[PDB]
Design an enzyme around this catalytic site. Structure first.
Site, PDB file in Angstrom:
ATOM      1  CG  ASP A  77      -1.507  -7.935   5.482  1.00  0.00           C
ATOM      2  OD1 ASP A  77      -1.295  -8.751   4.582  1.00  0.00           O
ATOM      3  OD2 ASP A  77      -2.169  -6.888   5.297  1.00  0.00           O
TER       4      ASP A  77
ATOM      5  CG  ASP B  77      -0.527   0.102   2.513  1.00  0.00           C
ATOM      6  OD1 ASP B  77       0.647   0.479   2.722  1.00  0.00           O
ATOM      7  OD2 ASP B  77      -1.335  -0.193   3.420  1.00  0.00           O
TER       8      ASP B  77
HETATM    9  O1  LIG Z   1       0.669   5.835   7.211  1.00  0.00           O
HETATM   10  C1  LIG Z   1       0.580   6.631   8.416  1.00  0.00           C
HETATM   11  C2  LIG Z   1      -0.786   6.352   9.037  1.00  0.00           C
HETATM   12  O2  LIG Z   1      -0.822   4.928   9.272  1.00  0.00           O
HETATM   13  C3  LIG Z   1      -2.098   4.529   9.786  1.00  0.00           C
HETATM   14  O3  LIG Z   1      -2.122   3.118   9.830  1.00  0.00           O
HETATM   15  C4  LIG Z   1      -2.671   2.448   8.675  1.00  0.00           C
HETATM   16  C5  LIG Z   1      -1.534   2.165   7.687  1.00  0.00           C
HETATM   17  O4  LIG Z   1      -1.169   3.370   6.966  1.00  0.00           O
HETATM   18  C6  LIG Z   1      -2.002   1.184   6.627  1.00  0.00           C
HETATM   19  O5  LIG Z   1      -0.865   0.760   5.871  1.00  0.00           O
HETATM   20  C7  LIG Z   1      -2.668  -0.032   7.294  1.00  0.00           C
HETATM   21  O6  LIG Z   1      -3.259  -0.904   6.305  1.00  0.00           O
HETATM   22  O7  LIG Z   1      -3.745   0.407   8.134  1.00  0.00           O
HETATM   23  C8  LIG Z   1      -3.233   1.145   9.233  1.00  0.00           C
HETATM   24  C9  LIG Z   1      -4.370   1.329  10.255  1.00  0.00           C
HETATM   25  O8  LIG Z   1      -5.454   2.038   9.645  1.00  0.00           O
HETATM   26  C10 LIG Z   1      -2.188   5.067  11.191  1.00  0.00           C
HETATM   27  O9  LIG Z   1      -3.424   4.630  11.759  1.00  0.00           O
HETATM   28  C11 LIG Z   1      -2.185   6.581  11.113  1.00  0.00           C
HETATM   29  O10 LIG Z   1      -2.214   7.138  12.431  1.00  0.00           O
HETATM   30  C12 LIG Z   1      -0.922   7.039  10.398  1.00  0.00           C
HETATM   31  O11 LIG Z   1      -0.977   8.470  10.170  1.00  0.00           O
HETATM   32  O1  LIG Z   2      -7.073  -8.519   4.666  1.00  0.00           O
HETATM   33  C1  LIG Z   2      -5.727  -8.986   4.825  1.00  0.00           C
HETATM   34  C2  LIG Z   2      -4.928  -8.671   3.562  1.00  0.00           C
HETATM   35  O2  LIG Z   2      -5.503  -9.451   2.522  1.00  0.00           O
HETATM   36  C3  LIG Z   2      -4.699  -9.453   1.345  1.00  0.00           C
HETATM   37  O3  LIG Z   2      -5.385 -10.183   0.342  1.00  0.00           O
HETATM   38  C4  LIG Z   2      -5.327 -11.612   0.476  1.00  0.00           C
HETATM   39  C5  LIG Z   2      -6.736 -12.156   0.296  1.00  0.00           C
HETATM   40  O4  LIG Z   2      -7.535 -11.844   1.436  1.00  0.00           O
HETATM   41  C6  LIG Z   2      -6.729 -13.676   0.116  1.00  0.00           C
HETATM   42  O5  LIG Z   2      -8.015 -14.224  -0.260  1.00  0.00           O
HETATM   43  C7  LIG Z   2      -5.849 -14.028  -1.031  1.00  0.00           C
HETATM   44  O6  LIG Z   2      -5.720 -15.448  -1.174  1.00  0.00           O
HETATM   45  O7  LIG Z   2      -4.557 -13.572  -0.694  1.00  0.00           O
HETATM   46  C8  LIG Z   2      -4.451 -12.159  -0.665  1.00  0.00           C
HETATM   47  C9  LIG Z   2      -2.978 -11.874  -0.565  1.00  0.00           C
HETATM   48  O8  LIG Z   2      -2.474 -12.266   0.710  1.00  0.00           O
HETATM   49  C10 LIG Z   2      -4.521  -8.059   0.795  1.00  0.00           C
HETATM   50  O9  LIG Z   2      -3.519  -8.087  -0.253  1.00  0.00           O
HETATM   51  C11 LIG Z   2      -4.086  -7.106   1.889  1.00  0.00           C
HETATM   52  O10 LIG Z   2      -4.120  -5.769   1.309  1.00  0.00           O
HETATM   53  C12 LIG Z   2      -4.995  -7.227   3.101  1.00  0.00           C
HETATM   54  O11 LIG Z   2      -4.444  -6.388   4.129  1.00  0.00           O
END
Ligand SMILES: OC[C@H]1O[C@@H](O[C@H]2[C@H](O)[C@@H](O)[C@H](O)O[C@@H]2CO)[C@H](O)[C@@H](O)[C@@H]1O
Ligand SMILES: OC[C@H]1O[C@@H](O[C@H]2[C@H](O)[C@@H](O)[C@H](O)O[C@@H]2CO)[C@H](O)[C@@H](O)[C@@H]1O
Length: 179
Positions: free
Chosen positions: A138, A28
């Protein structure tokens, strides 16, 4: 039977008594919830996109809490060892079972990740995700470092371990160090 960790009497999947975890991979580009990038910007340090780093499910990330910034377990390291198992249709068996150590630098929130990260208590409280695991990891995959392991969502056993020296030194730059 693709999942090799069998549920105990409380529903928690284990393998020879050790707790199991599920794993996924994510990309991401965000700095992430442990502040491992420049203050005030959403830009991660390159090492935080390149190395073996993880976003665990929320209740492990904050040791039972709901904080998604500087969670209690930011900077911890976990050793993940494949069992050979996987969730059918959502993974595969890896080519070997070498263990790999990852450092916690981000969080997988319940919101939007219910299947894997929707666990309503921390490890040890017998709460599991929809696949029977007490915690989920993850794995950051920006540069294909999970593909380089040939891991497709493997089932693993998990343990907290001291971090390798290079990951400890990296973590010192994160804003949540000493929060
Ligand atoms: O990237 C800074 C931002 O991170 C936030 O956490 C996110 C994270 O960016 C994302 O990669 C992940 O999938 O989800 C987390 C939780 O929502 C964090 O919560 C923020 O405070 C921060 O500014
Ligand atoms: O929600 C956790 C994580 O999932 C990731 O996608 C998975 C998906 O849920 C699963 O069905 C598939 O087999 O594998 C993918 C890859 O691991 C997704 O890429 C993440 O962004 C998300 O945080």
């Amino acid at each position: 039977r693709a999942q090799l960790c069998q549920p105990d009497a409380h529903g928690v999947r284990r393998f020879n008594g050790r707790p199991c975890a599920s794993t996924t991979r994510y990309v991401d580009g965000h700095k992430g919830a442990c502040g491992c990038g420049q203050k005030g910007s959403d830009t991660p340090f390159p090492w935080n996109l390149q190395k073996h780093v993880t976003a665990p499910s929320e209740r492990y990330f904050d040791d039972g809490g709901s904080n998604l910034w500087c969670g209690k377990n930011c900077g911890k390291c976990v050793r993940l060892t494949p069992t050979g198992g996987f969730v059918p249709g959502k993974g595969g068996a890896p080519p070997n079972h070498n263990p790999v150590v990852f450092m916690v630098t981000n969080a997988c929130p319940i919101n939007g990740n219910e299947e894997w990260c929707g666990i309503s208590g921390k490890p040890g409280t017998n709460h599991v995700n929809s696949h029977g695991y007490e915690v989920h990891f993850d794995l950051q995959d920006q540069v294909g470092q999970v593909e380089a392991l040939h891991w497709d969502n493997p089932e693993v056993t998990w343990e907290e371990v001291p971090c390798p020296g290079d990951l400890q030194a990296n973590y010192q730059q994160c804003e949540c160090h000493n929060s």
